[PDB]
């Protein structure tokens, strides 16, 4: 439902159910959100702006782990947990219209939203990662539907 339909699925669903799908990307930072897709677009442009020392500052590499349970990202070098989000608390994931390599997802804290912003090591990877997040939403949904009689 407004999530990734099956013909766009990048993974055998088993890789989101019995395991996670793990990617690396640059982390640009997380931003608190007042509230469209304006939200993601606005936050993406701001977070990129914050990361420009112009040249870009040496932003950390994170490992993003995606399953039907939700999303975790940790520092790729240090391995410390930056955030673990249950999938129910994730509203959406989207690409930056201005830089298609950049992508974000939004979580529900409290009573405010946070937008977590990343830049893939490739534009192709930004598509694949967003598609994976999309698929994880749909797989979680399908598992939940079948759970209750």
């Amino acid at each position: 439902t407004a999530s990734t339909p099956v013909q766009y699925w990048q993974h055998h669903p088993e890789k989101l159910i019995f395991q996670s799908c793990d990617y690396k990307a640059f982390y640009l930072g997380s931003m608190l959100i007042k509230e469209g897709t304006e939200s993601t677009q606005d936050a993406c442009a701001k977070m990129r702006a914050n990361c420009q020392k112009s040249q870009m500052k040496k932003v950390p590499t994170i490992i993003l782990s995606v399953s039907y349970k939700g999303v975790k990202f940790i520092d790729a070098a240090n391995k410390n947990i930056i955030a673990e989000h249950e999938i129910r608390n994730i509203s959406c994931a989207a690409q930056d219209p201005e830089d298609l390599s950049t992508f974000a997802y939004i979580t529900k804290d409290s009573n405010h939203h946070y937008c977590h912003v990343f830049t893939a090591f490739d534009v192709n990877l930004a598509y694949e990662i967003i598609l994976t997040l999309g698929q994880a939403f749909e797989v979680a949904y399908q598992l939940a539907l079948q759970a209750r009689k």
């Binding site: 407004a2 959406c92 930056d96 298609l100 997040l133 939403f137 979680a140």
Partner: peptide
């Protein structure tokens, strides 16, 4: 570009 909403939200 790509945008997906989570039905479980």
């Amino acid at each position: 570009p790509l945008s997906f909403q989570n039905p479980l939200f």
